């Protein structure tokens, strides 16, 4: 798709030479076919010089080589100065177009860890560890002995006070002050039948 | 499993092409065998050119290819989605969001927009950024706003990471930055209006992708910005964020909405201008807000109506638009002259 611009530049050259001729209208497919014939003629000149200058041990085609090539391909070269009086004096040179660029980027992590490791070749680019390598996750360590047993004894105290409040407000209640429903609702006495089987049971 | 019938051209059209040169009266079977033999030669040259470009190693055939062919009981501990290497890379991303160096800033913005298939430094990343949005709205710092709003911009331009499942904890954090109370200092509100320009510009990039499904995107945000425009006795930061959010939605959105709101907000202009006794923070605040929204709504009316009768167009726009609307119409005519 990107090769098409030079062929259309050759079409612009054909249109400029038709403007030099003086054609107002044209047939577009015939103009493109003559452009194909023109680039095949250029390739035929090139093939002639290619197979022509391999007859020497040298490679470089000179001016007289192209003279013998154009006489071989049927052209009177004596009109080449006079056609100059036309061409580079009556047709304005069109310029080419090539807008190439190199973009910039930055993905600077800090991880290499192997410049020239075991398969040692100093022509490479180790990318990163953020994309290639991986790791493993645990995400849970505390390991604090005194803090752990403080948490355990605090939870034991919480269970003590919770069951204390529960059966404090549940059952028979006699308090310390008058009506300690909120602060200290101590469980009142049951007294039951057989104390020794209960109070001496491991 | 396959049948390769002979592609034979209709011999009557071949007789039309023949008798265009005027040969003779032609029988059918002669042209039939001619189409047969020409089809054999065409398919053999086609096999030759396929051998060429399957040694040229392309599945497409150009003209030049056939031109060269014409040469003839306790469970185990859990593990997060992160690894240690990419969560420290995650910490590099978050601290480059904090990062004062603009070289580290552009490195972070390029890393977010050009890490395709990351997908696992996804939502946990975006989750307490939005909580970090919520805390920093309360903390009210313009620097953390412009860092996170450009960070969403790099998130939106990363083409592989689809937003669809993870939309609905990001968009209200964007809209929270739009509405109100971005007040670092009272003479330093000027940078916040460009933020609301940038934030509504992000919403324009949002709305072109997700409203094909259930209309949270178009219908809810417009009815939010409609009723926020209805909300009287609110600060003008709400009024600027609503209209500029509606301004980024498109040409025809403003054509529907600011067709009655041309003169109705012009009444809001001359309620502010020649209005209160002395409140210069709200005066200078509302004035350039009404100035910016006038000349940004002006290309909507310039594309709709012609720039004739600027005195009558000011009467059609409640006076206060003229001649700044006519000056923007002259600027729109100069922009048309540039084309």
Swiss-Prot record, chain A:
Any one Gene Ontology molecular-function term assigned to this protein's record: RNA polymerase II general transcription initiation factor activity
Source superkingdom: Eukaryota
Residue numbers carrying Phosphothreonine: 103
Domain Histone-fold: 8-75
Subcellular location: Nucleus; Cytoplasm
GO CC aspect terms: nucleoplasm; nucleus; perinuclear region of cytoplasm; transcription factor TFIID complex
Induction field: Induced with triglyceride accumulation.
Main location class: nucleus
Single GO BP term: mRNA transcription by RNA polymerase II
Keywords per UniProt: Acetylation, Cytoplasm, Developmental protein, Differentiation, Intellectual disability, Nucleus, Phosphoprotein, Transcription, Transcription regulation
Disease linked to the protein: Neurodevelopmental disorder with severe motor impairment, absent language, cerebral hypomyelination, and brain atrophy: An autosomal recessive disorder with onset soon after birth or in early infancy. Affected individuals do not show developmental progress, are unable to sit or walk, do not acquire speech, have poor visual fixation, and show poor overall growth associated with feeding problems. Additional variable features include seizures, spasticity, and joint contractures. Brain imaging shows hypomyelination, thin corpus callosum, and cerebral and cerebellar atrophy.
Family that this chain belongs to: Belongs to the TAF8 family.
More about this protein: 'Taube nuss' means 'empty nut' in German.
Protein purpose: The TFIID basal transcription factor complex plays a major role in the initiation of RNA polymerase II (Pol II)-dependent transcription. TFIID recognizes and binds promoters with or without a TATA box via its subunit TBP, a TATA-box-binding protein, and promotes assembly of the pre-initiation complex (PIC). The TFIID complex consists of TBP and TBP-associated factors (TAFs), including TAF1, TAF2, TAF3, TAF4, TAF5, TAF6, TAF7, TAF8, TAF9, TAF10, TAF11, TAF12 and TAF13. The TFIID complex structure can be divided into 3 modules TFIID-A, TFIID-B, and TFIID-C.
Record comment regarding domains: Ectopic expression of the histone fold domain acts as a dominant-negative mutant resulting in differentiation inhibition.
Complexes and interactors: Component of the TFIID basal transcription factor complex, composed of TATA-box-binding protein TBP, and a number of TBP-associated factors (TAFs), including TAF1, TAF2, TAF3, TAF4, TAF5, TAF6, TAF7, TAF8, TAF9, TAF10, TAF11, TAF12 and TAF13. Interacts with TBP, TAF1, TAF6, TAF10, TAF11 and TAF13. Component also of a small TAF complex (SMAT) containing TAF8, TAF10 and SUPT7L. Forms a heterodimer with TAF10. Interaction with TAF10 is mediated mainly via its histone fold domain while interaction with SUPT7L is via its C-terminal region.
Protein's name in the database: Transcription initiation factor TFIID subunit 8
Originating organism: Homo sapiens
Taxonomic path: Eukaryota, Metazoa, Chordata, Craniata, Vertebrata
Residues of the full protein shown: 28 to 229 of 310
Curated annotation (Swiss-Prot), chain B:
Domain of life: Eukaryota
Location of Phosphotyrosine modifications: 119
Modified-residue entries (Phosphoserine), positions: 130
Location of the protein in the cell: Nucleus
Positions bearing Phosphothreonine: 114
Function noted in UniProt: The TFIID basal transcription factor complex plays a major role in the initiation of RNA polymerase II (Pol II)-dependent transcription. TFIID recognizes and binds promoters with or without a TATA box via its subunit TBP, a TATA-box-binding protein, and promotes assembly of the pre-initiation complex (PIC). The TFIID complex consists of TBP and TBP-associated factors (TAFs), including TAF1, TAF2, TAF3, TAF4, TAF5, TAF6, TAF7, TAF8, TAF9, TAF10, TAF11, TAF12 and TAF13. The TFIID complex structure can be divided into 3 modules TFIID-A, TFIID-B, and TFIID-C.
Family: Belongs to the TAF6 family.
Subunit structure: Component of the TFIID basal transcription factor complex, composed of TATA-box-binding protein TBP, and a number of TBP-associated factors (TAFs), including TAF1, TAF2, TAF3, TAF4, TAF5, TAF6, TAF7, TAF8, TAF9, TAF10, TAF11, TAF12 and TAF13. Interacts directly with TBP, TAF1/TAFII250, TAF9/TAFII31 and TAF12/TAFII20. The TAF6/TAFII70-TAF9/TAFII31 heterodimer forms an octamer complex with the TAF4B/TFII105-TAF12/TFIID20 heterodimer.
Disease (UniProt): Alazami-Yuan syndrome: An autosomal recessive syndrome reminiscent of Cornelia de Lange syndrome and characterized by delayed psychomotor development with intellectual disability, hypotonia, microcephaly, short stature, poor speech, and dysmorphic features.
Protein name as annotated: Transcription initiation factor TFIID subunit 6
Gene encoding the protein: TAF6
Range of the intact protein held here: 6 to 473 of 677
């Amino acid at each position: 798709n990107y090769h098409l611009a030079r062929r259309r530049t050759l079409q612009v050259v054909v249109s400029s030479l038709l403007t030099e001729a003086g054609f107002e209208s044209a047939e577009k497919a015939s103009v493109e076919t003559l452009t194909e014939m023109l680039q095949s003629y250029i390739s035929e000149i090139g093939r002639s010089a290619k197979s022509y200058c391999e007859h020497t041990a040298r490679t470089q085609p000179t001016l007289s080589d192209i003279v013998v090539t154009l006489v071989e391909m049927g052209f009177n070269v004596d009109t080449l100065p006079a056609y100059a009086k036309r061409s580079q004096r009556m047709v304005i040179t069109x310029x080419x177009x090539x807008x190439x660029x190199x973009x910039x980027x930055x993905x600077x992590x800090x991880x290499x860890x192997x410049x020239x490791x075991x398969x040692x070749x100093x022509x490479x680019x180790x990318x990163x560890x953020x994309x290639x390598x991986x790791x493993x996750x645990x995400x849970x360590x505390x390991x604090x002995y005194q803090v752990l047993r403080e948490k355990a004894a605090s939870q034991r105290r919480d269970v003590e006070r919770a069951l204390t409040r529960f059966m404090a407000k549940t059952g028979e209640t006699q308090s310390l002050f008058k009506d300690d429903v909120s602060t200290f609702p101590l469980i009142a006495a049951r007294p039951f039948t057989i104390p020794y089987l209960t109070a001496l049971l491991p | 499993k396959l049948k390769l019938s002979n592609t034979v051209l209709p011999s009557e059209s071949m007789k039309v092409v023949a008798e265009s040169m005027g040969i003779a009266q032609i029988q059918e079977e002669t042209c039939q065998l001619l189409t047969d033999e020409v089809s054999y030669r065409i398919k053999e040259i086609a096999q030759d050119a396929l051998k060429f470009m399957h040694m040229g190693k392309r599945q497409k055939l150009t003209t030049s290819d056939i031109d060269y062919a014409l040469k003839l009981x306790x469970x185990x501990x859990x593990x997060x989605x992160x690894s240690v290497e990419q969560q420290l890379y995650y910490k590099e991303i978050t601290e480059a969001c904090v990062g004062s160096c603009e070289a580290k800033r552009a490195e972070a913005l390029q890393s977010i927009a050009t890490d395709p298939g990351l997908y696992q430094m996804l939502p946990r990343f975006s989750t307490f950024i939005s909580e970090g949005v919520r805390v920093n709205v309360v903390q009210n710092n313009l620097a953390l706003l412009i860092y996170l709003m450009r960070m969403v911009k790099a998130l939106m331009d990363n083409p592989t990471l689809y937003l669809e499942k993870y939309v609905h904890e990001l968009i209200p954090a964007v809209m929270t930055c739009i509405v109100s109370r971005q007040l670092c200092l009272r003479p330093d509100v000027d940078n916040h209006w460009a933020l609301r320009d940038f934030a509504a510009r992000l919403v324009a990039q949002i709305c072109k992708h997700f409203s094909t499904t259930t209309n949270n995107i178009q219908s809810r945000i417009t009815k939010t910005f409609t009723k926020s425009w209805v909300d009287e006795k609110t600060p003008w930061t709400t009024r600027y964020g609503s209209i500029a959010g509606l301004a980024e939605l498109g040409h025809d959105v403003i054509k529907t909405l600011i067709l009655p709101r041309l003169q109705q907000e012009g009444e809001r202009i001359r309620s502010v201008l020649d209005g209160p006794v002395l409140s210069n923070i709200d005066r200078i605040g509302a004035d350039h807000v009404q100035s910016l929204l006038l000349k940004h709504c002006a290309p909507v009316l310039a594309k709709l109506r012609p720039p004739p009768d600027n005195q009558d167009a000011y009467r059609a726009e409640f006076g206060s638009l003229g001649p700044l609307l006519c000056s923007q119409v002259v600027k729109a005519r100069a922009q048309a002259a540039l084309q």
